[PDB]
Amino acid sequence: DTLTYSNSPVPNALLTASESGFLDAAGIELDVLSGQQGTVHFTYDQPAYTRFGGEIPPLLSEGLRAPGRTRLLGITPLLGRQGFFVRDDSPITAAADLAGRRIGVSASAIRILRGQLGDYLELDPWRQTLVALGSWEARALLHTLEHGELGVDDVELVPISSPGVDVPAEQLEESATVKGADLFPDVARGQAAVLASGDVDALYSWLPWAGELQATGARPVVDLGLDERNAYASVWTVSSGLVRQRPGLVQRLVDAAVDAGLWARDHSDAVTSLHAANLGVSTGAVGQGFGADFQQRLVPRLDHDALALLERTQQFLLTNNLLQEPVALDQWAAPEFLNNSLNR
Ligand SMILES: O=S(O)c1ccccc1-c1ccccc1O
């Protein structure tokens, strides 16, 4: 059987199972989305498509645009190096030092931080979701400033390009695939240039990109990776029709991912290498961006704690008017598959 697929720059068992041969052994092959069919990463408009990535796009698709296209198979938390970075030689060493300083943020984050979404509800799926992705910077800045007893009104917001948030349709369509290596090349080099421009004092970085940025000689004012309130819930989705029409196939898919997750615990280097190649980053940056022993936490989850994390992100979207009505997570989830896999 052949399924189309994609994954965000996050640790996940779908990519692991595919590159390690577990899917092949299960008689399943995956074809990554080309740049020309890349919008599916945000719309889920395909009959046999599966994605393991950030939760914002699927929450918007299910809760705002097209209820019913997907089912949730599992969750894998994400937490690692994260925060507003400054150059090592910067006199800024504490959160309080950000008072009155120039914070570089995406146009999307600026809409959210100002509480002025503009034409948000009238935008097409791709551009609309990109506005919501400004949430990462927005929440991170609020939490960072809290440490210095400051608020957003205490700093200067300056527009800059942020990876994953600023992705023009032309850029997407020109990319060979939606793999991080093709869509997000040399991110840290670009962020280091922004910090060297003389027009900004700090900017948001995370994922392996933050690891490479740190290597250029930069540091986070506050490492948000040290506090769980900055974690996100990566989600694994699949076309709803496959769940209803081909449960046997979905079960084989989930079994393979679970086996790959167990296997990963004893093959840390191989797992680090395959994620690094998929995203186009150094192997050392993977560990910094996802956490030292992320390979021990790759078996997908649907327990109460994992669902609460996903709900937390959803609430940030609702509070900030990026969603009007919430997605019923218990209905969206199809726990039977993961439950059967873990009972083997
Ligand atoms: O998928 S998102 O949640 C996501 C999460 C984290 C980093 C990048 C993206 C992303 C943004 C735009 C287009 C493709 C992407 O993978």
Side-chain angles (χ1 to χ4, degrees):
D1 299 90
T2 300
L3 306 174
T4 50
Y5 93 105
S6 71
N7 59 272
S8 300
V10 306
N12 68 282
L14 178 63
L15 174 65
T16 305
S18 180
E19 295 300 319
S20 65
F22 278 99
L23 289 179
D24 184 65
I28 299 173
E29 185 168 59
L30 309 180
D31 290 323
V32 69
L33 294 174
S34 68
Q36 300 179 302
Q37 300 199 316
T39 59
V40 176
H41 187 75
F42 284 8
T43 70
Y44 307 90
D45 182 33
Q46 282 193 338
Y49 172 64
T50 185
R51 169 183 180 286
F52 207 147
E55 67 265 55
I56 298 177
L59 282 172
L60 260 55
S61 191
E62 291 293 327
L64 184 65
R65 307 186 289 257
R69 283 183 175 154
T70 70
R71 293 303 295 285
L72 176 70
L73 301 177
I75 298 166
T76 291
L78 164 70
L79 185 65
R81 191 59 49 65
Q82 180 194 323
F84 274 80
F85 282 73
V86 300
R87 282 177 58 92
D88 283 324
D89 54 35
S90 169
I92 296 170
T93 61
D97 298 322
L98 292 172
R101 304 311 306 191
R102 304 160 299 170
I103 313 300
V105 280
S106 66
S108 295
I110 289 176
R111 289 199 195 190
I112 300 173
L113 289 164
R114 288 177 179 175
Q116 299 178 296
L117 301 186
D119 59 15
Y120 180 68
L121 294 172
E122 299 175 358
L123 296 176
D124 51 287
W126 191 260
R127 297 231 287 291
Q128 185 177 67
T129 296
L130 292 182
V131 172
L133 296 190
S135 289
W136 306 317
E137 287 160 289
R139 194 177 74 179
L141 186 59
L142 292 172
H143 290 176
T144 296
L145 294 179
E146 271 181 34
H147 273 291
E149 300 181 65
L150 297 171
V152 188
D153 300 319
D154 298 308
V155 304
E156 300 288 311
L157 301 185
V158 178
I160 67 164
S161 175
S162 190
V165 184
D166 289 288
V167 185
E170 320 78 61
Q171 184 188 309
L172 178 69
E173 297 178 57
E174 292 184 0
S175 185
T177 73
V178 296
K179 291 184 178 181
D182 293 325
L183 198 55
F184 309 117
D186 311 300
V187 171
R189 185 175 64 186
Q191 296 186 319
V194 175
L195 289 179
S197 73
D199 298 330
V200 175
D201 295 310
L203 63 76
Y204 178 75
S205 192
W206 66 326
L207 311 184
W209 304 327
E212 299 200 332
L213 178 56
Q214 184 116 49
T216 71
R219 54 183 165 72
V221 180
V222 177
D223 186 357
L224 302 177
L226 299 176
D227 193 306
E228 185 278 348
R229 72 171 182 171
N230 298 294
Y232 288 100
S234 297
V235 296
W236 187 19
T237 56
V238 67
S239 298
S240 297
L242 288 182
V243 165
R244 180 59 183 166
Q245 300 168 39
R246 302 286 299 295
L249 169 57
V250 179
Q251 190 58 250
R252 278 187 285 136
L253 177 63
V254 177
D255 287 344
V258 172
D259 289 337
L262 293 172
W263 172 84
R265 299 176 180 176
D266 297 309
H267 300 72
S268 297
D269 286 2
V271 175
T272 293
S273 297
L274 66 92
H275 279 81
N278 182 254
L279 307 178
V281 298
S282 68
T283 59
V286 175
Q288 294 172 293
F290 302 158
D293 64 312
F294 79 88
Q295 305 97 325
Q296 304 302 311
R297 298 177 281 286
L298 286 173
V299 176
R301 301 163 53 184
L302 281 184
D303 53 89
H304 70 287
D305 288 315
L307 286 169
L309 177 57
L310 178 54
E311 188 69 62
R312 188 171 71 188
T313 303
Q314 170 156 69
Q315 292 308 312
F316 183 88
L317 298 178
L318 286 161
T319 291
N320 288 285
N321 234 334
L322 295 166
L323 274 179
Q324 300 179 305
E325 282 300 306
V327 176
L329 303 188
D330 295 312
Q331 293 165 46
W332 187 27
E336 61 262 36
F337 299 104
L338 184 62
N339 186 60
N340 293 318
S341 295
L342 299 177
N343 287 308
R344 290 177 296 168

